[PDB]
Amino acid sequence: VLFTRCEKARKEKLAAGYKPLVDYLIDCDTPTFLERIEAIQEWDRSRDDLYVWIPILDRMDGLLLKVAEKYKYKQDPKKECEVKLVEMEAHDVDYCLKMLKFTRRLLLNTENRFVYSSGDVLMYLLNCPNFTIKLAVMRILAILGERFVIAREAHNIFGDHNLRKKTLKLALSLSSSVMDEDGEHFSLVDLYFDKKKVPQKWRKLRFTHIKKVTMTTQELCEHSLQQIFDKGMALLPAESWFDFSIKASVAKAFSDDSGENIDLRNIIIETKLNAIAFVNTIFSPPQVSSKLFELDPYAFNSLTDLISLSETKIPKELRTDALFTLECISLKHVWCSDIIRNLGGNISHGLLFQILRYIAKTLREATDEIDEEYNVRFFYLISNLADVKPLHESLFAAGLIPTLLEIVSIRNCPYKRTLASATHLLETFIDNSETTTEFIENDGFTMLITSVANEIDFTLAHPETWQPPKYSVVYYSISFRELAYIRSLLKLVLKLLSTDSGDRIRNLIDSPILVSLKKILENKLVFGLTLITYTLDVVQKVINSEPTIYPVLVEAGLIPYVIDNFPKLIGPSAELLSLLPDVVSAICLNPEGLKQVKEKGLINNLFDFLLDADHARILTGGDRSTEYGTDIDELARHYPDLKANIVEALCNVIRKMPSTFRNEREFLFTSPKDQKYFFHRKNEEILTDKEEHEPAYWELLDKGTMLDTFTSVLFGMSLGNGSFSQVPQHLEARDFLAIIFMENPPYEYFTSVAISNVTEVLQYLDEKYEDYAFMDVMKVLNDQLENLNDFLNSPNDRSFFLERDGENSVRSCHSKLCRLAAILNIVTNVYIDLTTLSCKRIMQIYSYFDKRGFSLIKNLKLLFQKCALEEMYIRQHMPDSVITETMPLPIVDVSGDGPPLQIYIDDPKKGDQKGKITSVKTRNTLQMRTILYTLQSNTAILFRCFLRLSHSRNMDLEHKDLTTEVHIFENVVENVIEMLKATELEGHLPYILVLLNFNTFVFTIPKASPNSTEILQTIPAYIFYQKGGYLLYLHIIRDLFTRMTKILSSLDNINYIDESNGILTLSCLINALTFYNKSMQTETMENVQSIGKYYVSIDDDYNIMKALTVPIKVMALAMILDLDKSDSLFKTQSRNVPYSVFKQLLSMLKNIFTNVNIYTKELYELHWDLIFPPIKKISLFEQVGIPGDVAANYLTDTGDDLPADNSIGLFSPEQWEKYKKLIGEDKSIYYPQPMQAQYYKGCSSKELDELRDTFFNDGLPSRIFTVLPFYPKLVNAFAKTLLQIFTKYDEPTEVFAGRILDRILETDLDDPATLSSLIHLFGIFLNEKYIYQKASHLMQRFIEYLEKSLKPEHVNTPWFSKALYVYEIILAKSELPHLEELSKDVLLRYPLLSMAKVFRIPDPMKQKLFDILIRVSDISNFYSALATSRILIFYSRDELYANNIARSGILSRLLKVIGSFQKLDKINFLESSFLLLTRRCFETTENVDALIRAEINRSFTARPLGAVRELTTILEEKAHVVMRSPSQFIDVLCETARFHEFDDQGALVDYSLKRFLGEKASSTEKSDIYERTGIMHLLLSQLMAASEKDWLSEPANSSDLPENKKAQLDPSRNPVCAYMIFLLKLLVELVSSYNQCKFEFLTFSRRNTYAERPRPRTTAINFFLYRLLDKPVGTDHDKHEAKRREVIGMLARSVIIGFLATVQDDRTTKTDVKLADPHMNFIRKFAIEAIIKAIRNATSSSKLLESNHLKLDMWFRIITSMVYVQAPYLRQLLDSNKVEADQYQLCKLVIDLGLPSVITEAMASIDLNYPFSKKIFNVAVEALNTISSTRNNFSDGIILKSTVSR
C-alpha cells in the first residue's frame, strides 16, 4: 500500500483517537480481557475500524492461536489427518466462543474490517467434533467471506483443500429440501416443524470411498463424535471424513427424537446456511444450481414461506440464521425475481406487505416485540432487494408507498435504530416520479413536516439525556442514536430536495423549521453537528432548486444573518470546503445575495484557516483540493475585482507564509555508541535497528502537511492564471521565496512532492515572466551559497566531517545544504535548459555574466571536490559490511545525471538491499550520502549544456556572447579541471578516477537521439589543447599498461562490481580510449572554421578541428613508437590487453591514418577578447580614453590591425599622456601568438609521415603479426589500414604470407581449433588479393602440401569446418573460371590478359583429393556441410566429374541427414545451392549440352532485333549459360554466332553479334528411362518417413500468435512440413527439367523391384493417383496443417500439371508436337484410369461418395487445370507455345477417349440430398464447359523458376 506520509500518519492519528480507550484492553490481563470478551457486545454508537485494535486483534489471535495446537487442531492443508476431531474443552470452547462471538459482534459492530490482525488459526480450530467451535467458526467464516466479497474478494488460504472442500460439500452438506418416504419433504418451510414424517433409518450413515462404510442404527447412539470418527477412520480412509461427520451429526440428532434432535438439526442447518451464503459468495448458479438445483429446487417459494414476524412462532435462531444467508443469496438478481414472484410482487397483501403492515403496527404499539436486529436486517435486505427495477415497479403496483407510510407516522418511539433503518430503506427505494406523486398525494408529504416539528421540539425535550459518543470526538453534545436517526432523516430529505423541488418548495416555503431553522444555526450542540453540513447541503440545493425564493426567504431573516455569522463558522469541513463555491460564489451575483456578500467584505473571511494544516488535511491534499482549486474560480468569473482580495486577502497571510515557519526537531543525530555521525572504520559496530533512513516529519509537519493541500489548490487555481494575474503585480515571488528556504529545510526535500503543483504553477511566470526575478533568484541564491561557503571552504585533505564527528558542524547547515542543492536541481530541470530558447532569459543570463561572470563555478568546484572525497575517504573508514547493504549512492531512484558507475559492493544487479538493519550513522546520512552525487553531475550536464546553444539555439540573440561566452568557457574549463589538474594517480584513485570518468562523459554534446555519438564539443577540446593534458595522459598510459604488472579471472567477459584492481587500473582509462578515437573524428563531430579565416594577423591559418586532429596524432605516434621500443606487447606475449580492449585498439588504431586532406598549418591560440573583429584595439582606445565610437572609427576604417601610434584624428595627441601610460612595448602582442606542436614542429604530416616510414623502416607493421595470435581472429575487419600501408608499400607482407605458407605447416596442428583460426586470418592475407594474382609458385608451393595435407578422413579436422572456406580461397582461384589460361593467339587489339596467375590447377591434382573428397563424407557442422556442397556444385565441372559425383553415397549422407532433420534454422542457402546442384547433379549431357546447343540458335539468336546483342551486352549476359557448363557451353559456342562487321584487312572492329552460326537416334526410347537407377524404391519411402512423420503437427511455437500469424500465413512452421515443402518443390522441379525425373517415379514401391522398361510397379503411380497426394485428414485439426492442405490443393494441381510437361526447354515451342515416344505417349494417359475408378469409387457407397469429396473437390480443379493446362503456379516457367499441342493433344485426346460424359453420370450417381452436392457441381459446370469449349476450335513466397533462371 502507498502509505504516503499522510496516510500512515492518519493511521497513527487513529490510535490517539482510540488507543487511549483500547489502553483499557491493551493494559489488562487476558483473564480481565476474557471477562471483557462478552462484556462489550457492540458500540452504543456507530461502527468503527479495527486498526487501533490491530494490537488487541493479535492479542486475541495469540489467546486463540496456540489453542489449535492445544488439541493438535493446528491443521496442515497438505497432511491428510484432518487433525483428528476430538472434543474441545467447554471452558476453552467458551474461551473461544467468547472471542468468536465477541469477534462475530466486533465484525458486526465494526466497519472497515479489512485489517485482519487476529487470524492465524484459520482452518484449524474448526476441526473439532462439536459444532459449538466448528459451527461458530463456520458462521464467523461465512461472515468473513461476505466481508471479503464486500471487498470484492485478508489471508490467501484459497489453496486449502481441507476447509475449502469441507465448505464446498457443506453447500449440499446433506441436501437442501430433502425428501422422505412420506409425501412431506423435510421442506425448507419446516424450520422447526417436527409435524412431518421423521425417518429413523438415518440413525446410521453409509459412505462409499468404493470404500463403503456403516454407522448402523443405534450404533450411532453410544459412539459419540470422537468414537464415531474413530470407527469411521477404521471403516474409512483417514483422508476423507467430511460426509462421514456430516451424516454422523445427522444421525446423532436422529439418535434421539428429542430436543437434541431438533437442536442439532438447527445446528447443522445453520452450518449449512453459512456454507450456502459463502458458496453463493464464491459460487454462482452455474455452480450453485449445478450442485443443488438439480437436487432440491424447492428453494424460492419455500424461502418466501419460511419465516415472518407475522409468523411470530419460529424460534428465531434458524429464522435469523437463514435471514442473513437467505439475505446474501437473495442479493443476486437470479434469485431476486424468484422470491419476488413467489410473494406475488403485485399483491400489497401477501407476506410481501402482510408482514410489512403487521410490523408497522408492532411499531405503533412498540410492545418490545420488535427485534431491532432482525428489523434493521430485513430493512437493509429489501434495500438490497430494490435491485430489480421492473420488480420495483411491480411492488409499486403492490401498494408500495402508502403501505410504508403507515410507519412514517410512528414517532416518539424508542427504536431510533429501526427508525433509522426505516429511513434508510425509504431513501433506498425512492427512484420514481410516479412514486413521488404517490407519496406526495398519499399525504406522505405531510408526515414530512409532522416529524420535522415533532423532532425539532423533541430536541429540547431531552437536553437531560444528550449522551453522545463517549470515547470519540463529539463536535455536538446530543445523544448519538437520536441524531444518527436524524442523519438518516436529513439524508432522505436532501436527496428528496432536488426532485420535484419547485412545486414542493413552494408547498413548504415555511416547513416547521424554515423560520425556526435558526435553531440549527446555533443549536450546534443542541441540534447536533455535521447535520449543519447537511443544512449547507439544503442551502446549495436551494441555491439551485429555487434561487428566486432566496430574496423571498431573505425576508425570512435567516439568510442575511448567515452572512453576518458566516465569517465565524468558516472551518475545517471538506464538503463545505468543497461545496463552498457552489453555495457562495454564484450568489455573489444574485442582487440580494450580491449585496449580502459585498457587505462585510466576505472574501477575507473565506480563507481564515489559510494557515491551518487541519483544513489542508481536510481537503484531501488533492482532488477535492485541486478540484476546489479549479472550482472557486467561479467567483473570479463573477467578480474579478475581488481577486485583489483573493490576491491580498491572502498575501497578507501568504507573504507571512514564510514567516509562519517554526523551529522543529533534529535531523542529524549522533551515534548512540560513540556519538559520531560517520563510521570511522571498516570493522565498526552497527547502531542496529529496523527503522527508515529518512525521518518523515516535514510533510507530516503542519507546514509540510498544510503546504501539500496548499499547492494542490494552488495548481487548481493558478491554472489559467487568476489572482496570479495580479499577485506578481502585488507580490514578488523571489521576495516571497523564503518558503524555498523555510526555517529548517530538511534532508527530506527529496520528499518535494508538490513540486508539480509548485513548479508547474511557477511555470506560469515561466509562461509570463521568467525575468520576474530569475537572475535575481539566482543572485540571492549565490549570496546564500557564499553564506554556506563556511565549512564548504574545508580542508582539502579528507573528511574532517568524519574527524569532527559528534559536533554540530553540518547539523547547523545540514538542512540548508540539501534544501539548496535539490531545489536548484529542480529549478534547472523545470526551466534552466537549452529548451528555454527565450531571448529575454538569454539577456538576463548575460547580465549575470556581466555582474559576476563565472566566479560561482569556483564555489562549485570546491563543493564537488569535497563532495565524495569523504565517502571515498570514509569508505575505508566505512564498514563494507555496512556499505554492502547501505551503499548510499547505489540506491533506488538513482537513475539520472549519467552515473559514472561507482565502486559498488555486491553485483549492481541487486542494488538496494536495505530494510534489514539501520544505524544512526547510516540513517541520518544514508538519506544524504546517496543524495550527493545526484545533487552533482546534474550540475555538470548543464554546464556542458552551456556550450553549444547558439550553434543550435540561434533564435533572436545578440553579440554579447561573442566575447563573454568565450570568456565564460575560459572561466569554466580550467576552473574546475584544477580539481583534477593536481590529482596524480592514486589515493585520489577512487574519487578522482570517477571524476575523470564523468569528465570524459562531459565535453561531449549530449547528442545520442538516434543512438548517435555525443558530438564532443570543439571549444573545450581546444581550451584543453592549450592545456595539453592530453600529453599528460599520454604520459600516464605508460604507467597504465605497465600497471598491468601490478594486476585476473578473465580478460574480456567479466562485469559487475565486487573487486577488480585491474578494473580500477583501466576503469577510467576506457573512456580516454574512445575519447581519443573520436578525438580524431571531426567527421563524427561538428566542423568549426579556421582561425586564419577569423584572424588575418596570424601565421597558423587552419580550420581549428581539422588542424588539431594532427598534432595530437603526431605526439600519439611518438608515444606509439616509445611503447613499442620496449616492444610493449607489439611483438611480445601474455595476451594482456583484453580481447575487448584489444579490439578497441583497432578504432584507436584506425584513427592512426585518419587525416584531414589539406596540410595543417600549426595551431595558434585562444582568447576571449581578441575575437574577430579585434575588440582589443577599441578596448585600448578607451583605456587611453578614446570613446568606443571614435575608437571604433579606426578598426572599422582598418580592421584586423593595430595602430600603436599617437596623435591620430581619433587618437589626438592629448591622448599622448594616457597612451604613454598604456604603452607596454608589446602592442604588437595584443593579438594571439602561435602555439606549437609540443615536442615537435608541424601539427601535420610533417613528422607523422616520416615516423610512419620509420615503422616501415623499423618494420613494426610486421612485428604486430608476431602478436596477432593472441587476439587476431576477427581483426581481419581491421586489415584495411593495413591495406593503406600496403598501398604505400614501404614493406612487403606478401612476403610475410609466403613465410607463413612456409610456417603454415609449422602450424603443427596449431592448437587444433586454432589452426583454422589463425590460418583463416592467414588466408585473409590472400583475401587481400591484389598480388594474389601472382605468387602462383608460392601459391602452388603450398598447394603442393594442400595435396599432401590429404586428411582422407577430414572428420579428423573439425577446424576444417570452415577451413573449408580458407581453402575456398584457393578454390576461387582454383580454376578462376578455368578458361585454360589460353592466349587467344588471334586478331585482338585488347589485352584480355591473365590478370591472376592460377596455373589452372593441374587436373591430376584435382582427382587425388577428390577421391578423398568423396572419401571423407561426415566431418562436422551444418554450415561446413553448406560449404562442402557449394564447393562441389561450383565443381562437378567436367560433367563427368559430375557423373562420378553422382551415386557417390555422400548423396545418401545428404538425404538421410537433412531429410532426417527434426529442427533446423537457415538451410535456405543450401536449398538454393541444391536447386543449382540438381540442375548440375542431373546435368544430363543431351538435356544440358544438346539442350543449350538447340537453344544456341535461340540463346545468341534469342529472336534478335532482326540482331546485334553486343558481346558484352550478351556474352557477359550469357553468364547463366556460361556457368551452366563452361565446357559444354564453349562446345555449344563452338557453333554459335559467327558475327560480322570485321574490319576487312585482317582487322576487327565490332562486337554486335550478327550473321551465321559459329561456322554456319542419339537418344532412344530409354534415354531418360535407363537413366533411372531405382533410387525411388526406397528413397521416397525414407522420404515419406521424414514426411509422414506427422507433418501436420502444431510446432512448438508462440510467435505471439502460434497458429494465426504463421499457420494460415506460413504453414511451413511445423518443422516436419518445413522440409516436406522442399521435397515437393525440388521433386517437381527436377521432374519438369528432365524427362527421366518424370519417369523416375513410376515403379516406386515400399519394397524394391527393377524390371524391363521398369514394368510399372503400380504402387508408385496408383498411390500418387491416391492418398499420396490426398493424404486425407479428419478435419482442420491445426491451421498449420489445415492451411498446409489448402496450399496443397493450390499446389498439387501445378505439381501434376508440370509433371505432364515434356522437357520445359528448347522444345517448349511444342508448335505441332502431336505425340511422344512409344514409352511416353501412353505415359500421358497411363495411370489416369484408377482416378476414373476413383471417381467411380465415389459414385458407389454414398459415404464413400462423401469420403472422396476433397478428391472430387480437387477433381474439378484438377480437371480444369489438366484440360486448360493451367494452374496457380503455372506458365511462369512455360510458354504459350508449349500449349499449342498440349492443349490440343489433351482436349482432342480426351475427345478420343470420350470419357467426360461418363463422369457426368457420377453426378447421376448421387442423390441431391447433400448440402454441397448442389454446390459441388457448379465448379464442374466449368469442367463441363471445358468439355467442348477448348476443342470447339478443332476440326508471396511462391517460387517459379525457369531453366536459365537456374
Numbering used by the authors: 2 to 154, 158 to 213, 236 to 1073, 1076 to 1534, 1539 to 1592, 1598 to 1872, 2220 to 2230
Quote the authors verbatim.
Tom1p has been implicated in the turnover of excess levels of small, basic proteins including ribosomal components and histones. We determined cryo-EM structures of Tom1p to reveal a helical repeat solenoid architecture for the 2,888 residues preceding the C-terminal HECT domain and an overall architecture that resembles the published structures of HUWE1 but with a larger fraction of ordered residues.
In addition to the closed ring structure, the Tom1p^His^ dataset contains particles in “intermediate” and “open” conformations that were reconstructed to resolutions of 7.79 and 7.10 Å, respectively ([Fig fig7], S6C-D). The distinction between closed and open/intermediate conformations is modeled as a rigid body hinging of 30° (open) or 15° (intermediate) centered at a loop (1316-1320) in the middle of the Body domain at the opposite side of the ring from the N-terminal Head and C-terminal HECT domains ([Fig fig7], 7C). The resolution does not allow precise modeling of the change in conformation, but apart from the rigid body rotations, conformational changes appear to be limited to some repacking of the interface between the two halves of the Body domain and modest shift in adjacent helices ([Fig fig7]). When aligned separately, the N-terminal and C-terminal halves of closed, intermediate, and open conformation Tom1 superimpose closely. The hinging motion, centered on loop 1316-1320 (green), is ^∽^ 15° and ^∽^30° for the intermediate and open conformations, respectively. Published cryo-EM studies of human HUWE1 indicated the presence of movement towards an open state analogous to that of Tom1p, although density for residues C-terminal to the hinge were not apparent. Our structural analysis revealed a closed solenoidal ring structure and multiple open conformations suggestive of dynamic conformational changes to a spiral shape. One possibility is that this ∼29 kDa domain occupies the solenoidal basket, perhaps extending above the basket rim, and that it retains basic substrate proteins in the central region of the solenoid. It is also possible that the shift from the closed ring to the open spiral form is important for function. Mutations expected to destabilize closure of the ring conformation were reported to compromise E3 ligase activity of human HUWE1 and similar mutations of *Nematocida* HUWE1 were found to destabilize the protein.
